[PDB]
Design a protein around this nucleic acid. Structure first.
Ligand code: K
Ligand code: K
Ligand code: MG
Ligand code: MG
Ligand code: MG
Ligand code: MG
Ligand code: MG
Ligand code: MG
Ligand code: MG
Ligand code: MG
Ligand code: MG
Ligand code: MG
Ligand code: MG
Ligand code: MG
Lengths: 120, 233, 252, 49, 67
RNA sequence: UUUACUUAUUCAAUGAAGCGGAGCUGGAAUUCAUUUUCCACGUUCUAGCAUUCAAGGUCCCAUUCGGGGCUGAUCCGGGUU
RNA sequence: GAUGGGGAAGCUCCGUUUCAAAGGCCUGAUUUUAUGCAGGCCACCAUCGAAAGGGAAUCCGGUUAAGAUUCCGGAACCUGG
């Protein structure tokens, strides 16, 4: 009744905020990885320009998921092909898919990587 | 001592920005706080009709302590006591063909508004305690008059919470004694005398006196100023 | 049959004031303990032009009496107020041009500006350039001050209402002919869309009570009753009289 | 200004890169003289009573 | 019971006591929100007559409507 | 019909900061020398500065850090004005 | 243009800081855990609204059938860590 409260403003008191303790799971099965490597990398692009890039610029050209960003593309290429990635450039093609130019580091030769993965 | 110096701060107007002071008089309280305080204020700024404001007269501290000391010897059962009584009654009457009388006649305070009202109307209640803070007051405003008409001693006492502690509830709004044990009958008579002195004997007088009409601090000061000057000349 | 222009002004779509360049509302300090009991000293930092306003504003910085910080206030500059000048506001401030005083604390005949109508409304009266209020007397019992407003009206105000000593700066402004539709244009460009004005008599009947006719003419008395309704109140609303004013003002 | 050392943004004086030299000097003089005037005003008030 | 007394008393709305209570309560309701939860019936006998029971699941709301 | 009251209602403002009533002190009128009355109540040569529960004073504990209470900054009514 | 509120039979309308209990970011201690209790500092307030307003930082040379301040070569810079 006689507390000081040297301010004339009355603020909502801080009260305990209990964490949620649900009696049942909201989903009951966690969704598996929605973007794993095999759907981050949809398929290689084998146009003549892409093949020139593979042979000359040490750049693998992939069609990738429209939901995948450069980090996901880099880590998916690394996981799927055991290759270090120097850089990933991405564009959205006029047909609504995503094309990734994945320049590998100078240690690896994109032409032999392509040969190994099945397109020369 | 030679390194420290007295440097008084001039806290007058236009100097030395004011120190933090107790501003609890000027706090912008929440709406519910303001509403309950202003409802208490309005309830006495208005002229209170005599049916209400007889509840402004409560049992004093000593008489109330004595009354509750008597009433506490007649607490009703707790769930645990009732359970033990049920086992002690079944495990006796079932085996011994007793007529459910394995337990003595109980002596408990009677509570519940309808129950106590009916005991008053049947002249069974020997002492009625009426809480002075029943929020809808119509529930108990007729209780002093009912007790006066049926000749049942009544006391307006502080705390439906206290009556609830009497009857193992949060609030009870009433507490009645219809029968009291022989060892407590004398204390009941003395308490009834003291209570009747303050409530039932004064009923016919408190029924003609309006309450409220009380000014605030500042309005009272202004009335006192104009009465000191314009009236005492 | 159409909603007339003075009716359309109330919706305030294109008729709102053009307030982008304005410095802020011109107000006295909040009437606080320091001004109620003593005085508080601020300093004039800038005298600045306000868009749409004739009178210049004075940005006066006071110390915050309860928190260590500065409080800038936008006063209407009185004539003679200069930058770096100490302004004193309160019951105990001195009778000096630019000071803010309660009306009761100034002698009869004092000239004040930005006078409060009620104590604490922070300034209502004599705010336009060159205008001032004259204290014509006090009524100490039932504490009040009788004052003369710019319009010539006599008003009784609380003796606790404040005013600024002096006359609003920028006076004589209307003495210069505008000389140009362009100058009127630039004047109202920073006030509101109220210019130019088509005469109602040059309109059609659908547009205005005065519209229509094979000659331009009102057709009926232009003096319109106070009890008239919206769409009728065009012309001389509730005119007590018309014609060239001949004789003296200040009726009794 | 965040991509530059403190030297580029300040001057070695009582108000650095905030107030000019003449303004700071005027502040020094005003502070000193007004504090002296305050002392002598206090003495005048104490010796006029 | 007390509900009979409540019913008879609520019919004397221009009596001194009910006028006082009317004024105090109308001020309080006007100070509260236009619609707001009521903790308990203001007229428990009326609520019982209208089918209210003092158990979990029965809710009283107070509401203000322009006349 | 005219007057009073304030809590309904209405207007306004504020971060609801100093409201009301007493009291202390300071130039006073006089007392029945009880008590009555009024005024003020830390700031005005200067475009400086003014903030860290304010230093000081006093008291307690607990020791190497210090921590806390009161006063500084009068009391009472919790009616924000 | 939500919210708090108020209006409207109602679709919805007003209003945008307002008559709201509208707050997180700091840390002595707690480290039964860097949190809750528990020391203390700051709030008149969502959000949307500009590919010409404000705004962190990249240039040159070369390269394609069609991309380039984006690719390649070289040389920088800014932000966060
Ligand atoms: K015209
Ligand atoms: K016409
Ligand atoms: Mg891109
Ligand atoms: Mg014209
Ligand atoms: Mg025409
Ligand atoms: Mg017409
Ligand atoms: Mg006409
Ligand atoms: Mg014509
Ligand atoms: Mg319930
Ligand atoms: Mg809206
Ligand atoms: Mg935006
Ligand atoms: Mg731009
Ligand atoms: Mg091109
Ligand atoms: Mg490059």
């Amino acid at each position: 009744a006689l507390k000081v409260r040297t301010s004339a403003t009355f603020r909502l008191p801080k009260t305990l905020k209990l964490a949620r303790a649900p009696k049942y799971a909201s989903k009951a099965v966690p969704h598996y990885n929605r973007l794993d490597s095999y759907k981050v990398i949809e398929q290689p692009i084998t146009s003549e320009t892409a093949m020139k890039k593979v042979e000359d610029g040490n750049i693998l050209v992939f069609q990738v998921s429209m939901k995948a960003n450069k980090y996901q593309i880099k880590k998916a290429v690394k996981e799927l092909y055991e290759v270090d990635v120097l850089k990933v450039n991405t564009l959205v093609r006029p047909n609504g898919t995503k094309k990734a130019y994945v320049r590998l580091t100078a240690d690896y030769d994109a032409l032999d990587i392509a040969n190994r993965i099945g397109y020369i | 001592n030679p390194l420290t110096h007295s440097t008084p701060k001039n806290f007058g107007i236009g100097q030395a920005v004011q120190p933090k002071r107790n501003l609890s008089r000027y706090v912008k309280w929440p709406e519910y706080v303001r509403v309950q305080r202003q409802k208490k204020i309005l309830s006495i700024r208005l002229k209170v009709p005599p049916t209400i404001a007889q509840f402004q007269y409560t049992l004093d501290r000593n008489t109330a302590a004595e009354t509750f000391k008597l009433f506490n010897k007649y607490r009703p059962e707790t769930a645990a006591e009732k359970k033990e009584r049920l086992t002690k009654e079944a495990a006796a009457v079932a085996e011994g063909k007793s007529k459910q009388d394995a337990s003595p006649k109980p002596y408990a305070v009677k509570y519940g508004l309808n129950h106590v009202v009916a005991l008053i109307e049947n002249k069974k209640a020997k002492l009625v305690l009426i809480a002075n803070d029943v929020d809808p007051i119509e529930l108990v405003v007729f209780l002093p008059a009912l007790c006066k008409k049926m000749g049942v001693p009544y006391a307006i006492v502080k705390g439906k919470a206290r009556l609830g502690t009497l009857v193992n509830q949060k609030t009870s709004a009433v507490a009645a004694l219809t029968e009291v044990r022989a060892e407590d009958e004398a204390a009941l008579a003395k308490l009834v005398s003291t209570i009747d002195a303050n409530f039932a004997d004064k009923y016919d007088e408190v029924k003609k006196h309006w309450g409220g009409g009380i000014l605030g601090n500042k309005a009272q000061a202004k009335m006192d100023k104009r009465a000191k000057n314009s009236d005492s000349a | 049959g159409r909603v007339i222009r003075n009716q359309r002004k109330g919706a305030g779509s294109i008729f709102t004031s053009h307030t982008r360049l304005r410095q802020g509302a011109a107000k006295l300090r909040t009437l606080d303990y320091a001004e109620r009991h003593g005085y508080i000293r601020g300093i004039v930092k800038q005298i600045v032009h306000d868009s749409g306003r004739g009178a210049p504003l004075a940005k006066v910085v006071f110390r915050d009496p309860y928190k260590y910080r500065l409080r800038e206030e936008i006063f209407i500059a009185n004539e003679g107020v200069h930058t770096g000048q100490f302004i004193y506001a309160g019951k105990k401030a001195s009778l000096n041009v630019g000071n803010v005083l309660p009306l009761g604390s100034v002698p009869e005949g004092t000239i004040v500006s930005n006078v409060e109508e009620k104590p604490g409304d922070r300034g209502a009266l004599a705010r336009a350039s060159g205008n001032y209020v004259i204290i014509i007397g006090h009524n100490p019992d039932e504490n009040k001050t009788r004052v003369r407003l710019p319009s010539g009206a006599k008003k009784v105000i609380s003796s606790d209402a404040r005013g600024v000593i002096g006359v609003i700066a920028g006076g004589g402004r209307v003495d210069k002919p505008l000389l140009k539709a362009g100058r009127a244009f630039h004047k109202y460009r920073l006030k509101r869309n109220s210019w130019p004005k088509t005469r109602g008599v040059a309109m059609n009947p659908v547009d205005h009570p005065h519209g229509g006719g094979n000659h331009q003419h009102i057709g009926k008395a232009s003096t319109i009753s106070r009890g008239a309704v919206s769409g009728q109140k065009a012309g001389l609303i509730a005119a007590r009289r018309t014609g060239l004013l001949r004789g003296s003002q200040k009726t009794q | 200004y965040a991509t530059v050392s403190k030297t580029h943004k300040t001057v070695s004086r009582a108000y650095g890169g905030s107030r000019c030299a003449n303004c700071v000097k005027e502040r020094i003089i005003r502070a000193f003289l007004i504090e002296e005037q305050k002392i002598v005003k206090k003495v005048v008030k104490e010796q006029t009573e | 019971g007390a509900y009979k007394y409540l019913e008879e008393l609520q019919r004397k709305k221009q009596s001194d006591v009910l006028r006082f209570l009317q004024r105090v309560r109308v001020w309080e309701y006007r100070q509260k929100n236009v619609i707001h939860r009521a903790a308990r019936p203001t007229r428990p006998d009326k609520a019982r007559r209208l089918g209210y029971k003092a158990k979990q699941g029965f809710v009283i709301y107070r509401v203000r409507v322009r006349r």
